[PDB]
Amino acid sequence: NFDAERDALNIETAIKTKGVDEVTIVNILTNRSNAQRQDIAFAYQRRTKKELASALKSALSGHLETVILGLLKTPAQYDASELKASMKGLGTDEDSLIEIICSRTNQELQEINRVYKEMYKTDLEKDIISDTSGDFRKLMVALAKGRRAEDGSVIDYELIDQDARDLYDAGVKRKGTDVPKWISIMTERSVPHLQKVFDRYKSYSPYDMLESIRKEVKGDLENAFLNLVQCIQNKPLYFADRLYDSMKGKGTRDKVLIRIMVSRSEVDMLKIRSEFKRKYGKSLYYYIQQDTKGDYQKALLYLCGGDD
Ligand SMILES: O=C(O)C1=C[C@H](O)[C@@H](OS(=O)(=O)O)[C@H](O[C@H]2[C@H](O)[C@@H](NS(=O)(=O)O)[C@@H](O[C@H]3[C@H](O)[C@@H](OS(=O)(=O)O)[C@H](O[C@H]4[C@H](O)[C@@H](NS(=O)(=O)O)[C@@H](O)O[C@@H]4COS(=O)(=O)O)O[C@H]3C(=O)O)O[C@@H]2COS(=O)(=O)O)O1
Numbered sequence: 441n442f443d444a445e446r447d448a449l450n451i452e453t454a455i456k457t458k459g460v461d462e463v464t465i466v467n468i469l470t471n472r473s474n475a476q477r478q479d480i481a482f483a484y485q486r487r488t489k490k491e492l493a494s495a496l497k498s499a500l501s502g503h504l505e506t507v508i509l510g511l512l513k514t515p516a517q518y519d520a521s522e523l524k525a526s527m528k529g530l531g532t533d534e535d536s537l538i539e540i541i542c543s544r545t546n547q548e549l550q551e552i553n554r555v556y557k558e559m560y561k562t563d564l565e566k567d568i569i570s571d572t573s574g575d576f577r578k579l580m581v582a583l584a585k586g587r588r589a590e591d592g593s594v595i596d597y598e599l600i601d602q603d604a605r606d607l608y609d610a611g612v613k614r615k616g617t618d619v620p621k622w623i624s625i626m627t628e629r630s631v632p633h634l635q636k637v638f639d640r641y642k643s644y645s646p647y648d649m650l651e652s653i654r655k656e657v658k659g660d661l662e663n664a665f666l667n668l669v670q671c672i673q674n675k676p677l678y679f680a681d682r683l684y685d686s687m688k689g690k691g692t693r694d695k696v697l698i699r700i701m702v703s704r705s706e707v708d709m710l711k712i713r714s715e716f717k718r719k720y721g722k723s724l725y726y727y728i729q730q731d732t733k734g735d736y737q738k739a740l741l742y743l744c745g746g747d748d
């Protein structure tokens with residue numbers, strides 16, 4: 441059914457139409473997989489001898505341009521470019537750096553590290569170091585390696601219990617905090633293993649893992665731990681909460697809204713939508729529809745995949 445040559449032709453016609461036909465551009469690109477969009481990009485240059493990304497940057501503008509250009513990048517290229525943006529200058533946008541690093545899998549991070557190095561001619565780890573400090577740096581650097589332990593054939597309940605007590609001994613139980621212990625356990629163990637550790641943790645601590653973080657640490661280190669634990673406990677819900685935060689109240693934090701819709705549209709959007717509706721009462725579709733307008737809105741609603 442998919443025809444890259446046909447799509448590229450229709451996009452070119454839309455770009456050259458007087459005033460630019462954004463609707464057609466959105467209708468096509470937001471209804472094609474990332475892989476198909478790559479095929480469309482090669483077909484476009486093959487036909488016009490011009491790069492699609494460049495053509496669209498000139499033809500589009502505002503939030504819509506941001507969405508479209510983001511969709512044209514491969515998953516790794518997009519994440520790599522988003523990370524670079526968060527660390528730009530004094531990289532004061534720690535929240536974006538945290539979101540990406542705390543949610544990507546070993547496989548995703550392996551490709552991100554590779555592409556980041558190819559695109560910016562520098563190791564992702566070095567830029568992270570420059571935009572982080574203290575234990576916050578140690579945690580982010582560790583996570584970015586994407587070297588989380590694999591899932592064993594058999595569940596190690598003895599270790600699960602061990603880690604749970606260690607987490608407790610390292611924080612709430614003692615004066616101060618043994619941050620390195622928290623970092624080692626939360627970055628080295630597999631996600632599934634940690635989901636069980638956090639459950640078992642409730643048997644030793646009167647505060648769950650999240651509340652324990654709020655009482656033990658502060659600042660970016662605290663926020664990084666909060667994002668990590670949330671994502672480990674329930675990734676779809678984590679993104680649903682970040683999305684809600686990006687639209688609640690006056691205005692919109694477009695940087696977050698666009699990045700999540702673009703990066704998770706083909707990953708777990710169905711689960712994100714379900715968690716969103718369950719917690720916020722309204723559908724994600726409804727929130728997007730109410731916080732944005734025009735072609736930009738249309739594009740995001742297509743990435744949403746539907747109403748709930
Ligand atoms: O939640 C609010 O912050 C908010 C809600 C209320 O609706 C209203 O509050 S009230 O007390 O006045 O009653 C007020 O509305 C805001 C709106 O929230 C702002 N959006 S934000 O910038 O994202 O924070 C903003 O909206 C204007 C923006 O330029 C833009 O909004 S959005 O689509 O990004 O959400 C939109 O402008 C274009 C839009 O970019 C185009 N998109 S396309 O992809 O190119 O097709 C397209 O949709 O057209 C619109 C409108 O174009 S026009 O304005 O040139 O005709 O909408 C803008 C707008 O509606 O003004 O500002 C409004 C109004 O706030 S103000 O203080 O009265 O100026 O706040």
Ligand SMILES: [Ca+2]
Pocket residue numbers: 459460461462
């Ligand atoms: Ca137009």
Ligand SMILES: [Ca+2]
Pocket residue numbers: 496497498499500501502505
């Ligand atoms: Ca432009």
Ligand SMILES: [Ca+2]
Pocket residue numbers: 610611612613614615616617656
């Ligand atoms: Ca303590």
Ligand SMILES: [Ca+2]
Pocket residue numbers: 686687688689690691692731
């Ligand atoms: Ca809003």
Ligand SMILES: [Ca+2]
Pocket residue numbers: 691692731732733
């Ligand atoms: Ca808005």
